[PDB]
Design a protein around this nucleic acid. Structure first.
Ligand SMILES: Cc1cn([C@H]2C[C@H](O)[C@@H](COP(=O)(O)OP(=O)(O)OP(=O)(O)O)O2)c(=O)[nH]c1=O
Ligand SMILES: [Ca+2]
Ligand SMILES: [Ca+2]
Ligand code: NA
Length: 329
DNA sequence: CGGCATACG
DNA sequence: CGTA
DNA sequence: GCCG
């Protein structure tokens, strides 16, 4: 009925169990703030199972036989179904630890480990961080200065203008190179935390050295508020996006892949994050193959699969094809 | 109980 | 350590 | 936290 890996089932962007999945994802996020990747994964997988169901869960017995629902996740759903709230979830939501770890980890340049250290040092607010700026990396200073803009969602309707400026820079850097929108927007999201572009060229090898040339040109056009190099193949930058009478900062990721690897990079960067983790787990644990954003490796034959398309990759792995809009695990 | 995705900057 |  |  319900397979155990998220890559084995369609997961649409919008579904019939939103409130239940959001509660489980709070517990997932809190598990992550405490360093328990295992508990985070189970809560995320349980949430994702609900996203794949064809109708709302209305009674506890509808969880019977679903994967990733044991005593804990089932108790969470039960309380939500009976009372409209789950005490554990609310306790997490209002905890000082959760709220502060959430605030700090949302800063670009701050991960769970840094946030945790700052929390143990007694820091609680962004103004706390701004008072001692000498303790911040350059990346964190930019994340902190731009935090307000970066906390507002990027709209799908912003994306086309941004893709056009990136295409112009890419075209000058390397005529014939292409720009593909990936990430959540390619899965159909109408808003997202950042924009993801995948760049390649139809002649294998021509893309080598491309990304510094692209970044230089965008920086010369005045469009880059931050990037790490202001050789590489991924750039995590903050872009100047036009707005009425002004502009806002937005996060934009650029990645370059050779065309031979483009299907693997397209698959990886289109996500969702849980979908890719589950796909790589399935590949390795069920098929004996090692998957990443560069390729698919058979460690017995010591050979890489060639792929001309995402469809090829699903077929290699023995999985029914899922379009990007059904990869919202 | 072991395992939990897999990279690059 | 950060990032995807 | 859950699966196998
Ligand atoms: C963060 C992250 C992303 N990815 C891949 C899959 C993600 O869909 C893709 C883009 O990363 P994100 O931009 O972080 O996620 P997103 O585009 O799906 O969500 P949003 O709309 O909020 O911006 O990169 C991983 O494979 N592993 C990770 O840890
Ligand atoms: Ca994104
Ligand atoms: Ca991104
Ligand atoms: Na962060």
């Amino acid at each position: 009925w319900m397979p155990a890996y998220a890559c084995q089932r369609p997961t649409p962007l919008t579904h019939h169990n939103t409130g239940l999945s959001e509660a489980l994802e709070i517990l997932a996020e809190a598990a992550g703030f405490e360093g328990s990747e295992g508990r985070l994964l189970t809560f995320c997988r349980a949430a994702s199972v609900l996203k794949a169901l064809p109708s709302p869960v209305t009674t506890l017995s509808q969880l019977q036989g679903l994967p990733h629902f044991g005593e804990h996740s089932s108790r969470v759903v039960q309380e939500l179904l009976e009372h409209g709230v789950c005490e554990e979830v609310e306790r997490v939501r209002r905890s000082e630890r959760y709220q502060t770890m959430k605030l700090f980890t949302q800063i670009f340049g701050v991960g769970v480990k840094t946030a945790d250290r700052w929390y143990r040092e007694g820091l609680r607010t962004l103004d706390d961080l701004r008072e001692q700026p000498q303790k911040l990396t350059q990346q964190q200073k930019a994340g902190l200065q731009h935090h307000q803009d970066l906390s507002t969602p990027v709209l799908r309707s912003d994306v086309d203008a941004l893709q056009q400026v990136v295409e112009e820079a890419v075209g000058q850097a390397l005529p014939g190179a292409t720009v593909t929108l990936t990430g959540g927007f390619r899965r159909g999201k109408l808003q997202g935390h950042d924009v993801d572009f995948l760049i390649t060229h139809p002649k294998e090898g021509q893309e080598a050295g491309l990304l510094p040339r692209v970044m230089c040109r965008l920086q010369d056009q005045g469009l880059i508020l931050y990037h790490q190099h202001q050789a590489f193949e991924r750039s995590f930058c903050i872009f100047r996006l036009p707005q009425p009478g002004s502009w806002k900062a937005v996060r934009v990721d650029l990645v370059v892949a050779p065309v031979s690897q483009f299907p693997f990079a397209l698959l990886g960067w289109t996500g969702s994050k849980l979908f890719q983790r589950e796909l790589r787990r399935f590949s390795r644990k069920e098929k004996g193959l090692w998957l990443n954003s560069h390729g698919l490796f058979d460690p017995e034959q010591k050979t890489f699969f060639q792929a001309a398309s995402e469809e090829d990759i699903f077929r290699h792995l023995g999985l029914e094809y899922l379009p990007p809009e059904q990869r919202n695990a």
